[PDB]
Amino acid sequence: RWRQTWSGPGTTKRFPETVLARCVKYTEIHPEMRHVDCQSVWDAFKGAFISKHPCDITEEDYQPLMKLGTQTVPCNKILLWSRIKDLAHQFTQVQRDMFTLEDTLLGYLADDLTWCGEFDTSKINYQSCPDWRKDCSNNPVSVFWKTVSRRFAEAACDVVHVMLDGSRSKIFDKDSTFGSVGVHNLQPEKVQTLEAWVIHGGREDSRDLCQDPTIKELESIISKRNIQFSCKNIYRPDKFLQCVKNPEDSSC
Ligand SMILES: NC(=O)c1ccc[n+]([C@@H]2O[C@H](COP(=O)(O)O)[C@@H](O)[C@H]2O)c1
């Protein structure tokens, strides 16, 4: 067929087997998650979206999965990000101290995957899935990330860090998961400071992007929640990672 139902790419091929193997791999590696039955995790993940209209997904749909994926993360070591995925993960892979959402069981299971079902059947739809923008925002993928990003934001305390892509015209974007979910779910009783790291798009020799209008916006929103705002430019992300791997020595 030359026309699919939805505008988004369909479910990642071998979704069941991929999620299940990711669950095995994660629970083998991370000792705190050793009790976790992966078949049950798969069962609950399925239950959230199978036989349900892929434009009528709710956070409740994912609560059984959230229960099984209950995980304590060091609340003062949380790294959020927006758009600038790869440096965030490369950073935490060396700084095995800070944690992104994808360093948790639930984020690790879903990272870069797409999935949806159909109301009329228990079939997984490998042909197409709702686009958040063209089709509906209550779809299995978008609702999953909203639910898990909210809980992750709520667990943070002390200094929370966020990496932003400073080569976007909207370095801070009110419409990203970070801007719509993360910023509004940090708990002012616990979170002392949000510190933004503005990742430069290379170039070299460049602007203080902590003065960018959208950063002033972020600063204002955060300050009015009674949380301190801090910002740092990361001019050379290639040198940053190098300094993380080899603190001091040369030009760090
Ligand atoms: N790894 C993914 O596939 C994925 C997708 C959307 C959101 N997220 C989470 O939400 C935030 C980033 O999303 P935005 O780029 O919409 O701000 C991060 O905290 C991230 O962990 C992850």
Where do the domains of the chain lie, and which CATH numbers do they carry?
Answer: 1-72+100-155 (1.20.82.10), 73-99+156-252 (3.40.50.720)
> From the candidates 75, 129, 210, 243, which is the catalytic residue?
75
Distance 81 CA to ligand 1 centre (A): 7
Instruction: List the structure tokens of 210.
Output: 């902590």
- Among 44, 38, 45, 40, smallest CA distance to 22 is for 38
Resolution of the determined structure in angstroms stands at 2.0
> Can you say whether the dihedral through the CA atoms of 134, 137, 142, 144 is positive or negative?
negative
CA 193 to CA 23: how far, in whole Å? Answer: 33
Listed in sequence order, the residues at least 6 apart from 20 whose beta carbon sits closer than 8 Å to its beta carbon are: 38, 39, 42
Q: Is the CB of 79 under 6 A from ligand 1?
A: no
Long-range contacts at 243-250 (CB < 8 A, ≥ 24 apart): 244/91, 244/94, 244/95, 245/94
Whole-number Cα distances in Å, 165 to 55, 86, 198, 212: 30, 11, 6, 12
CA 244 to CA 250: how far, in whole Å? Answer: 13
> Can you say whether the dihedral through the CA atoms of 168, 169, 171, 173 is positive or negative?
negative
CA 142 to CA 159: how far, in whole Å? Answer: 27
DSSP states along the chain: --S-SSSEE-PPTTHHHHHHHHHHHHHHH-GGGTT--HHHHHHHHHHHHTTS-TT---GGGGHHHHHHT-----GGGBEEEES-HHHHHHHHHHSTTSB-GGGSHHHHHHTT-----BTTBS---SSEE--TTTT-SSSHHHHHHHHHHHHHHHH--EEEEEEEETTSS-SS-TTSHIIIIIHHHS-TTTEEEEEEEEE--S-SS---GGGSHHHHHHHHHHHHTT-EEEEEEES-HHHHHHHHHS-SSS--
Other CB atoms within 10 Å distance of the CB of residue 120: 8
CA 150 to CA 3: how far, in whole Å? Answer: 35
Asked if 157 is an active-site residue, the reply is: yes
Residue 241 amino acid letter: L
CA 152 to CA 146: how far, in whole Å? Answer: 10
Q: Is the CB of 149 under 6 A from ligand 1?
A: yes
Whole-number Cα distances in Å, 57 to 27, 60, 112: 27, 8, 19
CA 78 to CA 101: how far, in whole Å? Answer: 8
CA 93 to CA 11: how far, in whole Å? Answer: 28
Instruction: List the structure tokens of 251.
Output: 């030009």
Which residue from 22, 178, 199, 218 has its CB within 8 A of the most atoms of ligand 1, so it is best to mutate?
178
